[PDB]
């Protein structure tokens, strides 16, 4: 299968900015008939992809002139000249020259914002849950920027891999920050077999892990 690599994978942009995304194939997409089948689509957060550039540089019909594709053989480039809020979403390049056709990983354009350190809060199981037999320890890492955060559960100093479920919100509408929830589920007489539960987070804002804990 041909591999398509897109750069960056996340592009913060202030509205009105110029922006460039790139797509590199693991081999030439020039076809024997001379055409290069490199396409670019935009997926906006709740819907189907919409077509933007066909065969490396030709815009589709209603695509604003702001969009421009460039590149040849294996390295291609999309550029947006004055980004607008309606242009926020995920960008994917597509090679149709080799079977199977493959897409690039996606590049999300998002709003630049100042860094914001997270608010970490850990929650022991409820009386209600323990009475029913289970134990979920929940850690909320609210309102941070940039999206890249790495959270781990360590119960009594061991890092627990198994049993945590994570969920992320989209970039906040009136704030531009991100939020994450991490839930660790054990059984009551299993949770009862240890006592400190820690939720430590690593993020750009702090050189030290953000550690919340209890017993």
């Amino acid at each position: 299968d041909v591999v398509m690599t897109q750069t960056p994978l996340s592009l913060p942009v202030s509205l009105g900015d110029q922006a460039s995304i790139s797509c590199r194939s693991s081999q030439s997409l020039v076809h024997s008939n001379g055409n290069t089948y490199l396409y670019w689509y935009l997926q906006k957060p709740g819907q189907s992809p919409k077509p933007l550039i066909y065969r490396v540089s030709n815009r589709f019909s209603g695509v604003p002139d702001r969009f421009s594709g460039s590149g040849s053989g294996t390295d291609f480039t999309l550029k947006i000249s004055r980004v607008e809020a309606e242009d926020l979403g995920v960008y994917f390049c597509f090679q149709g020259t080799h079977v199977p056709y493959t897409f690039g990983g996606g590049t999300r354009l998002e709003i630049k914002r100042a860094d914001a350190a997270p608010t970490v809060s850990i929650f022991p199981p409820s009386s209600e849950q323990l009475t029913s037999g289970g134990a979920s320890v929940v850690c909320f890492l609210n309102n941070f920027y940039p999206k890249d955060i790495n959270v781990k559960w360590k119960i009594d100093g061991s890092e627990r891999q198994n049993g945590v479920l994570n969920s992320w919100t989209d970039q906040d509408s009136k704030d531009s920050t991100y939020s994450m929830s991490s839930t660790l589920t054990l059984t009551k007489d299993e949770y009862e077999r240890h006592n400190s539960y820690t939720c430590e987070a690593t993020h750009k804002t702090s050189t030290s892990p953000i550690v919340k804990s209890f017993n």
Partner: protein, 215 residues
């Protein structure tokens, strides 16, 4: 004008089969290819294969041949995709798209296929109150954990509608055939405990819970 309008069963048991349709309108069905593409959320797009409605000829992605089977009914200008022997890895959103041989331009809206062994299940809603003592500065963050429900959606509301500021409802994740969702609400330290906060959770497929975060 041109519309690929999808429709095809969406909650299915593992080991079964599901046939999803894609009725085309606004252009001559026969002149273009229908391409089908799979998207596993939080991720990229995979090309499954195509059909040429004129001849009935197809080409599949090696990965999907045997799993996907592609079919057209030129009398109704509707194209189908049957998936077979479903497993969890098959829960994704599937798209048909009109296109030429090498690439697609206009895409249909998507059909979400969820593979699960569940029955309809009312959620367990759990209050998540602050850990203890050594915590709060200007704010206190409370939370509602609602778990083990099928199918989607739930309505989580904090104080029956007002208290719109400060909440984040995380997207539901399926884990072991049932879903879990969670919500944080951050309020000022002179608001809680004094002023009671309740989380209200509703599940169309069954019935409603209202839970107060005491302590």
């Amino acid at each position: 004008q041109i519309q690929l309008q999808q429709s095809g069963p969406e909650l299915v048991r593992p080991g079964a089969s599901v046939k999803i349709s894609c009725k085309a309108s606004g252009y001559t069905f026969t002149d273009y290819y229908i391409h089908w593409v799979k998207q596993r959320p939080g991720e990229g797009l995979e090309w499954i294969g195509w059909i040429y409605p004129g001849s009935g000829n197809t080409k599949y992605n090696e990965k999907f041949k045997g799993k996907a089977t592609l079919t057209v009914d030129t009398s109704s200008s509707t194209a189908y995709m049957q998936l077979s022997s479903l497993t969890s890895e098959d829960s994704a959103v599937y798209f048909c798209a009109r296109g030429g041989k090498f690439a697609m331009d206009y895409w249909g809206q998507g059909t979400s296929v969820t593979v699960s062994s569940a029955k309809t299940t009312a959620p367990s809603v759990y209050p998540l109150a602050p850990v203890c003592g050594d915590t709060t500065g200007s704010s206190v963050t409370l939370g509602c954990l609602v778990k083990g429900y099928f199918p989607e959606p739930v309505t989580l509301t904090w104080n029956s509608g007002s208290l719109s500021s400060g909440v984040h409802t995380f997207p539901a994740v399926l884990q072991s055939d049932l879903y879990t969702l969670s919500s944080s609400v951050t309020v000022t330290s002179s608001t809680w405990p004094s002023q009671s906060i309740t989380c209200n959770v509703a599940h169309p497929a069954s019935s409603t819970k209202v839970d107060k975060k005491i302590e």
